[PDB]
Amino acid sequence: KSRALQADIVAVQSQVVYGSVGNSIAVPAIKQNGLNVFAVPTVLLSNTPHYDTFYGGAIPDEWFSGYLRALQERDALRQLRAVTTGYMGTASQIKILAEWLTALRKDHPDLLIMVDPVIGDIDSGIYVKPDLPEAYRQYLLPLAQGITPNIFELEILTGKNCRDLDSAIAAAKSLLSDTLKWVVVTSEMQVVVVTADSVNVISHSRVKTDLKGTGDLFCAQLISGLLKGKALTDAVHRAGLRVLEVMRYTQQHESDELILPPL
Amino acid sequence: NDKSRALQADIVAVQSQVVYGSVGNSIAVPAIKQNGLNVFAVPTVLLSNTPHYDTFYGGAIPDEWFSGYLRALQERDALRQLRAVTTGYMGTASQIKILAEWLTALRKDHPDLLIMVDPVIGPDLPEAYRQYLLPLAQGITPNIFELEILTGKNCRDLDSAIAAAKSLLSDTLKWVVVTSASGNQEMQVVVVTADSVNVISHSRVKTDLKGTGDLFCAQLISGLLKGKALTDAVHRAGLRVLEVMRYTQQHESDELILPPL
Numbered sequence: 001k002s003r004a005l006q007a008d009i010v011a012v013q014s015q016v017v018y019g020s021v022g023n024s025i026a027v028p029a030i031k032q033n034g035l036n037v038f039a040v041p042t043v044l045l046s047n048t049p050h051y052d053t054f055y056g057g058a059i060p061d062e063w064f065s066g067y068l069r070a071l072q073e074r075d076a077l078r079q080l081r082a083v084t085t086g087y088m089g090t091a092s093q094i095k096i097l098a099e100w101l102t103a104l105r106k107d108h109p110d111l112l113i114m115v116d117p118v119i120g121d122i123d124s125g126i127y128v129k130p131d132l133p134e135a136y137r138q139y140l141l142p143l144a145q146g147i148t149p150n151i152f153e154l155e156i157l158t159g160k161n162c163r164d165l166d167s168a169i170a171a172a173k174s175l176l177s178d179t180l181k182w183v184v185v186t187s188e189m190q191v192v193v194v195t196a197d198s199v200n201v202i203s204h205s206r207v208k209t210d211l212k213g214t215g216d217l218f219c220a221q222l223i224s225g226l227l228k229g230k231a232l233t234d235a236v237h238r239a240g241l242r243v244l245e246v247m248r249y250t251q252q253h254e255s256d257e258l259i260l261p262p263l
Numbered sequence: 264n265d266k267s268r269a270l271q272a273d274i275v276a277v278q279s280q281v282v283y284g285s286v287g288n289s290i291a292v293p294a295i296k297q298n299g300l301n302v303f304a305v306p307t308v309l310l311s312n313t314p315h316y317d318t319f320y321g322g323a324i325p326d327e328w329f330s331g332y333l334r335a336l337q338e339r340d341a342l343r344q345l346r347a348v349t350t351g352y353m354g355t356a357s358q359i360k361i362l363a364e365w366l367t368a369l370r371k372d373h374p375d376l377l378i379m380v381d382p383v384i385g386p387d388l389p390e391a392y393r394q395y396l397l398p399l400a401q402g403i404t405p406n407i408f409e410l411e412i413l414t415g416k417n418c419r420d421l422d423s424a425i426a427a428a429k430s431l432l433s434d435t436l437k438w439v440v441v442t443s444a445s446g447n448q449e450m451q452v453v454v455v456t457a458d459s460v461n462v463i464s465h466s467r468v469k470t471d472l473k474g475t476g477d478l479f480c481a482q483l484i485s486g487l488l489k490g491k492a493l494t495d496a497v498h499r500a501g502l503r504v505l506e507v508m509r510y511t512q513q514h515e516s517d518e519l520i521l522p523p524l
């Protein structure tokens with residue numbers, strides 16, 4: 001009874017008509033690892049707000065709710081192996097998103113969910129809808145099987161520890177459970193992998209640049225190796241090396257926007 | 264002029280975009296991309312899938328968004344390499360006015376800009392094109408139903424339809440590619456440039472697969488920015504559409520599926 005398109009992933013996040021970020025850099029990343037995917041956009045702008053202008057807004061909680069729901073009526077989740085979340089637009093979309101996911105596993109009990117808590121940074125955090133960090137903790141976390149937060153996106157989520165690598169691992173540890181299997185804490189110059197029992201600390205050297213999307217690149221390359229048979233740490237180390245690569249090529253290319261080189 | 268450290272592209276395709284599916288940019292951008300051509304696609308509507316299904320969600324982009332989007336590309340300075348711009352299924356009519364305006368602007372720094380326009384019609388849509396868009400296109404691809412309403416003329420033969428195309432050429436509008444499916448169905452196409460008339464035909468399969476045109480166009484343009492002579496290009500892109508459909512036929516897909524280049 002299957003003749004409708006099918007896909008591995010159902011990545012839900014930001015989409016730009018200009019710039020490398022959100023599904024506008026992740027989908028191409030995915031496709032390269034030989035994988036099908038569906039991009040359900042949360043917001044739909046012109047460019048990145050951090051630019052100088054930027055137009056467009058967020059997809060309404062009635063359209064965006066239809067999209068996901070559509071992928072189920074169309075029956076294209078026959079080969080679904082994962083769902084990933086990125087830049088959100090409203091804590092209501094996040095609630096919506098959850099309800100959808102929650103119904104999912106009852107058919108895809110082996111579903112992989114991967115959330116990226118897009119909320120803060122060093123300059124200043126919560127540079128997003130203030131309501132998002134609550135929606136994250138109350139709704140979209142009790143499902144994640146492995147999240148990729150950073151030192152500050154982790155402080156907000158746990159209401160816990162700070163700048164001590166240990167304090168961090170602790171806080172991460174306090175997050176694991178039956179559903180959450182792992183956690184990739186960042187601050188990418190130092191990346192700690194905290195498994196349900198074990199700890200790995202990968203570390204490379206990052207260059208200076210205001211390019212946005214690496215997070216989306218990284219995460220993308222991460223679900224790729226994981227949905228391809230790579231071990232956790234092994235997988236991470238690759239999605240991370242890849243992003244350092246990607247960044248060189250655009251610096252070499254002299255372009256304030258990411259550029260997906262070959263495979 | 265100093266180098267532009269921003270993203271660039273040859274086309275600025277403008278039409279629909281479906282989360283699930285193969286219509287509009289959702290199939291254009293890929294088709295384009297295959298011929299090794301960069302492109303900025305500007306949405307017009309954002310629907311779950313195409314309306315011709317049991318169910319579909321979404322609507323049409325806010326004028327303001329739809330505008331800022333356009334204005335954007337420029338404030339970002341990512342058009343130095345542009346050469347074309349192609350319309351597609353439009354949500355409103357105001358959009359066209361705006362899309363026009365913008366074009367009007369662009370057309371001042373890019374005198375060699377080829378504007379292709381598909382009269383995706385089948386309420387107010389007629390006029391907006393007549394008044395705002397039509398007067399700008401350097402080429403268009405309406406079918407019989409589309410050429411009839413866009414000229415207000417009727418035409419059930421070569422001469423008739425032809426004269427119509429002729430009755431739309433000018434100092435800006437250069438050619439007029441018309442198409443029809445006679446029925447199963449045939450491809451029946453006619454290339455009505457001002458100084459000549461070509462008519463290419465093909466035998467096509469029987470399907471409910473949409474997007475063939477968006478693709479065809481998507482391809483047509485590509486082959487055109489590659490210095491391929493019109494008529495020649497028109498054929499190829501026609502051929503392309505069939506090839507891809509066969510490919511999809513085999514895989515038995517209810518949506519289109521791009522093979523290799």
Ligand SMILES: Cc1ncc(CO)c(C=O)c1O
Nearest residue numbers: 014021022048049087213215
């Ligand atoms: C459009 C868009 N996409 C993705 C991100 C996060 O990388 C941001 C962060 O501000 C954004 O604005």
Ligand SMILES: Cc1ncc(CO)c(C=O)c1O
Nearest residue numbers: 279286287313314352474477
């Ligand atoms: C949304 C949408 N976009 C484009 C087309 C024509 O390719 C159709 C044809 O029905 C459509 O419904």
